[PDB]
Amino acid sequence: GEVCPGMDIRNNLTRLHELENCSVIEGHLQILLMFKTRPEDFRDLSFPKLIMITDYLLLFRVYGLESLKDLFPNLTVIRGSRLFFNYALVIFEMVHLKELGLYNLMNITRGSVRIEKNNELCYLATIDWSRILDSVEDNYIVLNKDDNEECGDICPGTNCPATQFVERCWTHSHCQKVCPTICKSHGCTAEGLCCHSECLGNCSQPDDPTKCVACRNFYLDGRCVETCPPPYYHFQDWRCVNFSFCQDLHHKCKCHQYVIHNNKCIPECPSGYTMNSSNLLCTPCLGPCPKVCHLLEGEKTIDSVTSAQELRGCTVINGSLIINIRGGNNLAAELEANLGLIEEISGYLKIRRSYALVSLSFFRKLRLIRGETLEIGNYSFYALDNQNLRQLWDWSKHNLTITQGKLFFHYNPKLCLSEIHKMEEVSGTKGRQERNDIALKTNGDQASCENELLKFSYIRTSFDKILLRWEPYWPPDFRDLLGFMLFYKEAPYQNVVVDIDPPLRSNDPKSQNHPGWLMRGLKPWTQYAIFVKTLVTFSDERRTYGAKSDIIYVQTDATNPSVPLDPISVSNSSSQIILKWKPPSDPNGNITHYLVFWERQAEDSELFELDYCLKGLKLPSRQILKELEESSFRKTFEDYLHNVVFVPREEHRPFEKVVNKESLVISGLRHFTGYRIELQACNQDTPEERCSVAAYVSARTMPEAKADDIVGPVTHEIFENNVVHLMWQEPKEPNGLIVLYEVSYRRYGDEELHLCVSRKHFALERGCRLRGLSPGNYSVRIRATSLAGNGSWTEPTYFYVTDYLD
């Protein structure tokens, strides 16, 4: 009929009365809150005009409705163009809905079905969705009255195409007429004829592209096509609009203003592609993209994490920035990953009234600021009441340029006038500013703008100890020195606490009064960041701020590596042991190799002679201003006493150097032998022996099969006094060592008896000797046990033992 957009329905059905006049819906359809509704609002209501819906269908809380076979008879296409948590069909909390009733459903190409909490719902098990959907594996159909099976889903075919193999029916008066024949996913008509290959489901005339019920892929000018020809673009993967309708959607959203890529009129370009206004095209950026974002009325006042995270992705901004964040949890890494993407600001930047920030180095790559939108008084950088900000940027790295406007620095008390002059020299704002734009006494009144650089005199190293010394530094009234602070942190790169006792001056002809500190508990092979600052008293005249040292990068030494972690071992083969480990916690430089030593172990000598024919036969299974004030109190006592006293008138194991592997197969071993294993690591082997101390494990291979299986003959003896002596061939290689022998023996008609033969019973009787036998035809069978287990039987050896009667 005619094209409507998507709409959302609440309360009433006057929205259903302007859903009467529509046929084609370009959007999504939601049903929520039909609290008022009756059966007599829904037995006089029918919409057969509707055929197509793009995005999704949502249902919530309908009273009084029973079915949709007399409400929605002709709905086929569920496209799923906007995929919505991969669920294109959601239905939640239907009371009184006994059936689904969408008997002309042939199409879900893209999307899945969520059914939940509809307590009156039968007619689900006679719907084959595999003819409809391309994949039914993601469909979430749960919590119905069909799921607790009492539902009388009766068919017309009790006629219906049966696809369990049950007869398939949507309603009681219509069948599952989705065509499984040679007409295929395009579908057949009611006469059984095939439709066109750009038709979908049904066709109003058979094999017609002009007269499909539903198009398969695309739609242009009363006909179903497979792709758009030029100048028409692929509009939302269902129809063909062109430059005029895509440009009227562009100037209607002048809203995701509609762009051209891959002959499609898509809403926004993807991440390799950028907007250029001259051609209206997704130009191929594929990397460092000029992302230009237009603001809402020239400003965005930003004050939290969630208000900060709107601009994550935007680089160039068309407007001004107002920043007012005063607190948070563990800042500037996520604020650096946010606000280090900014290149150019067209408006001003106003840092007003912030507290908790300590640097502006979360702003990473800011090079050019326009400042076209200004503050009244022509200000582009407005710093106001910003408390704890110690640095602006690092000026070995950063360059910044202000195009237009002036500066404003009022009440920013922890930042220096050399950084204000570095802003006025680097930023191009030397002659722009008027009188008292910079409030001079409010900024840098309480800081450390120290006017001297310390020099590191003497430096030593160890693996865990750095012996630092530097110069003697004093203030010129040197009772104000409290000593030094030095901060340490771990330094993996160059990408940037001990209180120190003061030294003793007295006098100096040549006096070594170099102070310093030995730091004791260091991690080996670790580059560190050490700098030394001074702690003076804020005096009553023009201030000596003190001095600070250079940051240095001093690395600790290696010496011995540590124990490499966790020796564990699983036996793969009988000659192969994989040894696996982890690297140590102190690697101590670039490690050359891992050094392993393996020793074959001899057996236990107690267990040659343990008779386990005796019972007990078990085998093992094998804050600062207090003490700033308090030291100036002893200065001013001493000034008072001076102003009233003084007045004018080898075991070589087999071993291997494991180069660039964290595992080693240990080959060349015997079957089922205990082993002794030394594991070490070594970062320096050829210029002398800096290998580590040993890691200790023991291991054992998996056993063989036929090492425990008995090879050799079964040979009896017949003596004079009815005594049977049996010898055999022992396996000379068992799995590890042999322990015990067992004889199962049974006469011709009798039962099987047992006998325990030990190794001392073998070695005393050269085999085994049997006495006291009933006369008959015995058969003897011998199993044997080792340290591993029970290797299997011998043959039945038939022998007639003597009777001495006949």
């Binding site: 010129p476 009234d477 040197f478 009772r479 007295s506 006098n507 001076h642 003084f646």
Partner: peptide, 18 residues
């Protein structure tokens, strides 16, 4: 011969007029 101060101003008064 500096800013003097401390306890060595008392030692400087000893070392002038010893």
């Amino acid at each position: 011969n500096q800013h003097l101060c401390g306890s060595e101003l008392v030692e400087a008064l000893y070392l002038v007029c010893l």
